[PDB]
Design an enzyme around this catalytic site. Structure first.
Site, PDB file in Angstrom:
ATOM      1  N   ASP A 164       0.564   6.166  12.974  1.00  0.00           N
ATOM      2  CA  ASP A 164       1.932   6.151  13.206  1.00  0.00           C
ATOM      3  C   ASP A 164       2.733   7.156  14.262  1.00  0.00           C
ATOM      4  O   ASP A 164       3.705   7.900  14.280  1.00  0.00           O
ATOM      5  CB  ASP A 164       2.704   6.782  11.889  1.00  0.00           C
ATOM      6  CG  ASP A 164       2.685   5.491  10.949  1.00  0.00           C
ATOM      7  OD1 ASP A 164       2.257   4.377  11.186  1.00  0.00           O
ATOM      8  OD2 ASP A 164       3.089   5.823   9.592  1.00  0.00           O
ATOM      9  N   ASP A 219       5.736  12.377  14.398  1.00  0.00           N
ATOM     10  CA  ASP A 219       5.598  12.116  13.030  1.00  0.00           C
ATOM     11  C   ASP A 219       4.213  12.599  12.508  1.00  0.00           C
ATOM     12  O   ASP A 219       3.789  12.036  11.277  1.00  0.00           O
ATOM     13  CB  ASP A 219       6.059  10.878  12.436  1.00  0.00           C
ATOM     14  CG  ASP A 219       6.436  10.836  10.883  1.00  0.00           C
ATOM     15  OD1 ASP A 219       6.567  11.905  10.319  1.00  0.00           O
ATOM     16  OD2 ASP A 219       6.511   9.638  10.291  1.00  0.00           O
ATOM     17  N   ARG A 269       0.316  12.772   5.481  1.00  0.00           N
ATOM     18  CA  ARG A 269       0.553  11.485   4.975  1.00  0.00           C
ATOM     19  C   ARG A 269      -0.029  10.458   6.239  1.00  0.00           C
ATOM     20  O   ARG A 269      -0.528   9.295   5.929  1.00  0.00           O
ATOM     21  CB  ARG A 269       2.054  11.186   4.674  1.00  0.00           C
ATOM     22  CG  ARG A 269       3.173  11.395   5.624  1.00  0.00           C
ATOM     23  CD  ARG A 269       4.595  11.299   5.294  1.00  0.00           C
ATOM     24  NE  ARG A 269       5.314  11.571   6.342  1.00  0.00           N
ATOM     25  CZ  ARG A 269       5.800  12.783   6.502  1.00  0.00           C
ATOM     26  NH1 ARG A 269       5.584  13.738   5.464  1.00  0.00           N
ATOM     27  NH2 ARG A 269       6.559  13.208   7.485  1.00  0.00           N
ATOM     28  N   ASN A 270       0.151  10.887   7.384  1.00  0.00           N
ATOM     29  CA  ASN A 270       0.142   9.929   8.628  1.00  0.00           C
ATOM     30  C   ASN A 270      -1.433  10.244   9.303  1.00  0.00           C
ATOM     31  O   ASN A 270      -1.697  10.154  10.076  1.00  0.00           O
ATOM     32  CB  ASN A 270       1.096  10.284   9.795  1.00  0.00           C
ATOM     33  CG  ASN A 270       2.275   9.549   9.348  1.00  0.00           C
ATOM     34  OD1 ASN A 270       3.316  10.030   9.539  1.00  0.00           O
ATOM     35  ND2 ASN A 270       2.247   8.471   8.654  1.00  0.00           N
ATOM     36  N   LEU A 313       0.871  -1.432   0.097  1.00  0.00           N
ATOM     37  CA  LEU A 313      -0.045  -0.288   0.044  1.00  0.00           C
ATOM     38  C   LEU A 313       0.709   1.142  -0.005  1.00  0.00           C
ATOM     39  O   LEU A 313       0.356   2.449  -0.459  1.00  0.00           O
ATOM     40  CB  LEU A 313      -0.913  -0.057   1.375  1.00  0.00           C
ATOM     41  CG  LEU A 313      -2.100  -0.850   1.189  1.00  0.00           C
ATOM     42  CD1 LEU A 313      -2.676  -0.963   2.406  1.00  0.00           C
ATOM     43  CD2 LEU A 313      -2.974  -0.562  -0.099  1.00  0.00           C
ATOM     44  N   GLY A 314       2.175   1.052   0.473  1.00  0.00           N
ATOM     45  CA  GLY A 314       2.937   2.308   0.669  1.00  0.00           C
ATOM     46  C   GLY A 314       4.157   1.857   1.598  1.00  0.00           C
ATOM     47  O   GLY A 314       4.360   0.828   1.890  1.00  0.00           O
ATOM     48  N   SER A 315       4.813   3.009   2.019  1.00  0.00           N
ATOM     49  CA  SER A 315       5.873   2.888   3.072  1.00  0.00           C
ATOM     50  C   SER A 315       6.144   4.043   3.805  1.00  0.00           C
ATOM     51  O   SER A 315       5.649   5.141   3.127  1.00  0.00           O
ATOM     52  CB  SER A 315       7.102   2.251   2.258  1.00  0.00           C
ATOM     53  OG  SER A 315       7.411   3.159   1.709  1.00  0.00           O
ATOM     54  N   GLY A 316       7.050   3.939   4.798  1.00  0.00           N
ATOM     55  CA  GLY A 316       7.574   5.307   5.232  1.00  0.00           C
ATOM     56  C   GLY A 316       8.818   4.929   5.874  1.00  0.00           C
ATOM     57  O   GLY A 316       9.570   4.044   5.949  1.00  0.00           O
ATOM     58  N   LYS A 346       1.699  -2.986   9.022  1.00  0.00           N
ATOM     59  CA  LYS A 346       3.113  -2.434   8.923  1.00  0.00           C
ATOM     60  C   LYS A 346       4.232  -3.334   9.321  1.00  0.00           C
ATOM     61  O   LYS A 346       4.095  -3.845  10.425  1.00  0.00           O
ATOM     62  CB  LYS A 346       3.177  -1.064   9.688  1.00  0.00           C
ATOM     63  CG  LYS A 346       4.439  -0.336   9.729  1.00  0.00           C
ATOM     64  CD  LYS A 346       4.450   1.018   9.076  1.00  0.00           C
ATOM     65  CE  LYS A 346       3.708   1.907   9.889  1.00  0.00           C
ATOM     66  NZ  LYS A 346       3.256   3.201   9.240  1.00  0.00           N
ATOM     67  N   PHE A 352       9.581   4.062   9.008  1.00  0.00           N
ATOM     68  CA  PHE A 352       9.633   2.661   9.741  1.00  0.00           C
ATOM     69  C   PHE A 352       9.262   1.418   9.144  1.00  0.00           C
ATOM     70  O   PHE A 352       9.940   0.499   9.663  1.00  0.00           O
ATOM     71  CB  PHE A 352       8.339   3.091  10.829  1.00  0.00           C
ATOM     72  CG  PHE A 352       9.009   4.454  11.826  1.00  0.00           C
ATOM     73  CD1 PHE A 352       9.787   4.151  12.991  1.00  0.00           C
ATOM     74  CD2 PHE A 352       8.118   5.574  11.178  1.00  0.00           C
ATOM     75  CE1 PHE A 352      10.077   5.380  13.654  1.00  0.00           C
ATOM     76  CE2 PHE A 352       8.615   6.830  12.280  1.00  0.00           C
ATOM     77  CZ  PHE A 352       9.373   6.552  13.337  1.00  0.00           C
TER      78      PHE A 352
HETATM   79  C1  LIG Z   1      -0.748   8.012   1.730  1.00  0.00           C
HETATM   80  C2  LIG Z   1       0.538   8.182   2.792  1.00  0.00           C
HETATM   81  C3  LIG Z   1       1.287   6.625   2.978  1.00  0.00           C
HETATM   82  O1  LIG Z   1       1.307   6.198   2.013  1.00  0.00           O
HETATM   83  N1  LIG Z   1       1.494   6.039   4.000  1.00  0.00           N
HETATM   84  C4  LIG Z   1       2.125   4.733   4.475  1.00  0.00           C
HETATM   85  C5  LIG Z   1       1.320   5.183   5.850  1.00  0.00           C
HETATM   86  N2  LIG Z   1       0.351   4.040   6.202  1.00  0.00           N
HETATM   87  C6  LIG Z   1      -0.698   3.731   5.884  1.00  0.00           C
HETATM   88  C7  LIG Z   1      -1.206   2.886   6.568  1.00  0.00           C
HETATM   89  C8  LIG Z   1      -2.490   2.126   6.381  1.00  0.00           C
HETATM   90  C9  LIG Z   1      -3.100   2.200   5.227  1.00  0.00           C
HETATM   91  C10 LIG Z   1      -4.444   1.629   5.124  1.00  0.00           C
HETATM   92  N3  LIG Z   1      -5.276   1.430   5.996  1.00  0.00           N
HETATM   93  C11 LIG Z   1      -4.706   1.571   7.271  1.00  0.00           C
HETATM   94  C12 LIG Z   1      -3.421   2.059   7.368  1.00  0.00           C
HETATM   95  C13 LIG Z   1      -0.501   2.709   7.847  1.00  0.00           C
HETATM   96  C14 LIG Z   1      -0.460   1.797   8.646  1.00  0.00           C
HETATM   97  C15 LIG Z   1      -0.705   0.284   8.490  1.00  0.00           C
HETATM   98  C16 LIG Z   1      -0.459  -0.473   9.532  1.00  0.00           C
HETATM   99  C17 LIG Z   1      -0.157   0.010  10.883  1.00  0.00           C
HETATM  100  C18 LIG Z   1       0.340   1.191  11.015  1.00  0.00           C
HETATM  101  N4  LIG Z   1       0.526   1.779  12.413  1.00  0.00           N
HETATM  102  C19 LIG Z   1       0.527   0.898  13.495  1.00  0.00           C
HETATM  103  O2  LIG Z   1       0.079  -0.032  13.729  1.00  0.00           O
HETATM  104  C20 LIG Z   1       0.866   1.976  14.703  1.00  0.00           C
HETATM  105  C21 LIG Z   1       0.951   1.532  16.058  1.00  0.00           C
HETATM  106  N5  LIG Z   1       1.225   2.680  16.524  1.00  0.00           N
HETATM  107  C22 LIG Z   1       1.562   2.521  18.214  1.00  0.00           C
HETATM  108  C23 LIG Z   1       2.521   1.365  18.615  1.00  0.00           C
HETATM  109  C24 LIG Z   1       3.121   2.856  18.598  1.00  0.00           C
HETATM  110  C25 LIG Z   1       1.378   3.514  15.995  1.00  0.00           C
HETATM  111  N6  LIG Z   1       1.044   3.344  14.699  1.00  0.00           N
HETATM  112  C26 LIG Z   1      -0.043   2.119   9.949  1.00  0.00           C
HETATM  113  N7  LIG Z   1       0.853   3.416   7.623  1.00  0.00           N
HETATM  114  C27 LIG Z   1       0.831   6.331   5.304  1.00  0.00           C
END
Ligand SMILES: *CCC(=O)N1CC(n2cc(-c3ccncc3)c(-c3cccc(NC(=O)c4cn(C5CC5)cn4)c3)n2)C1
Length: 307
Positions: free
Chosen positions: A156, A138, A142-143, A19-22, A46, A24
């Site tokens: 995130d 962060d 995007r978040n 779906l994408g990345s960052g 993630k 982390f």
């Molecule tokens: C548009 C910007 C982009 O491309 N990004 C990648 C990032 N993103 C999107 C998702 C996501 C997409 C669709 N549906 C849901 C989420 C995520 C993402 C996926 C899985 C899990 C996370 N984060 C966590 O699990 C998490 C846990 N914590 C706490 C323990 C500290 C914080 N975040 C995110 N990421 C946006």
């Protein structure tokens, strides 16, 4: 509370699409198959970047149990975790994607009511993190994820704290004290909030476009800031500017940002000037009920409507 975090085994879920990345890790659309069932349930996964050890995994798991308690309608909750040679975080899948991609794709179709309500919702989610004593570190468009066009949620947050790396880079979203001294507080998250509001009001423009990251601290020290978006009135721009003050204690508080953006959402054409705004209203009760029945049954405070 251990009941809020599910430990998942590699056999009950599969990543199916990127779906994408960052910074982390990579994000995937996955499928969860509950044991003994024939159904494939979509989830977001993630997968963290660095490989992990059993000692690190125990510390991560302990932190994850605390992190899974972060429960608010405007914050994405961590639902599950799979700890093997990699750390995989499972959350609810948001089919509309992130708010940054959303405002770019629907530019010249988004009204002031939506823009101002998204600012309110993001400030609500950030105020809840401040109430939990959790610094995001962060925050950016995007978040912010789109559950429905009427309901956004922050993701995130606290990923350095989950990994035990708080005391160890999105420069263009960082407060000057974070750039210079790696100091992160609820007030440096306020600076990032101002940048996020600026990204929304410019329909996803890149902040400081063309300026290299190494030059950003010097530009901020000279008093230069992001320019006024063409749709913002001076009152909206002054809030963004207050978010970027050198003195962190002079910046607004998230609870105050909820109040000011809620006031503005009650007379939206007075605070944002968008061409063809009179035909871009919030959905009627009929359309709102339908969206919620199909993809948003969770509890949530009412969206701010115009007087
Ligand atoms: C548009 C910007 C982009 O491309 N990004 C990648 C990032 N993103 C999107 C998702 C996501 C997409 C669709 N549906 C849901 C989420 C995520 C993402 C996926 C899985 C899990 C996370 N984060 C966590 O699990 C998490 C846990 N914590 C706490 C323990 C500290 C914080 N975040 C995110 N990421 C946006």
């Amino acid at each position: 509370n251990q009941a809020l975090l599910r430990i998942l085994k590699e056999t009950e879920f599969k990543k199916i699409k990127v779906l994408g990345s960052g910074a982390f890790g990579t994000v995937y659309k996955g499928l969860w198959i509950p044991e003994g069932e024939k159904v494939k349930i979509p989830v977001a996964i993630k997968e963290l970047r660095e490989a992990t050890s059993p000692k690190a995994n125990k510390e991560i798991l302990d932190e994850a149990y605390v992190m899974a308690s972060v429960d608010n309608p405007h914050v994405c909750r961590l639902l599950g975790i799979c700890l093997t040679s990699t750390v995989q975080l499972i959350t609810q899948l948001m089919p509309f994607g992130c708010l940054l991609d959303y405002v770019r794709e629907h530019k010249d179709n988004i009204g002031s009511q939506y823009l101002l309500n998204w600012c309110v919702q993001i400030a609500k989610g950030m105020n809840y993190l401040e109430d939990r004593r959790l610094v995001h570190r962060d925050l950016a468009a995007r978040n912010v994820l789109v559950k429905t066009p009427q309901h956004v949620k922050i993701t995130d947050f606290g990923l350095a704290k989950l990994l035990g790396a708080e005391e160890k880079v999105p420069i263009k979203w960082m407060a000057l004290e974070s750039i210079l001294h790696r100091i992160y507080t609820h007030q440096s998250d306020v600076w990032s909030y101002g940048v996020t509001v600026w990204e929304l009001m410019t329909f996803g423009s890149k902040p400081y476009d063309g300026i290299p990251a190494s030059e950003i601290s010097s530009i901020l020290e000279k008093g230069e800031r992001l320019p006024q978006p063409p749709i913002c009135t001076i009152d909206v721009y002054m809030i963004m500017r207050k978010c970027w003050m050198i003195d962190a204690d002079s910046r607004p508080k998230f609870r105050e940002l909820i109040i000011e953006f809620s006031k503005m959402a009650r007379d939206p054409q007075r605070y944002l000037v968008i061409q063809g705004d009179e035909r871009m209203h919030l959905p009627s009760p009929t359309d709102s009920n339908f969206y919620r029945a199909l993809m948003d049954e969770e509890d949530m405070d009412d969206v701010v409507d115009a007087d």
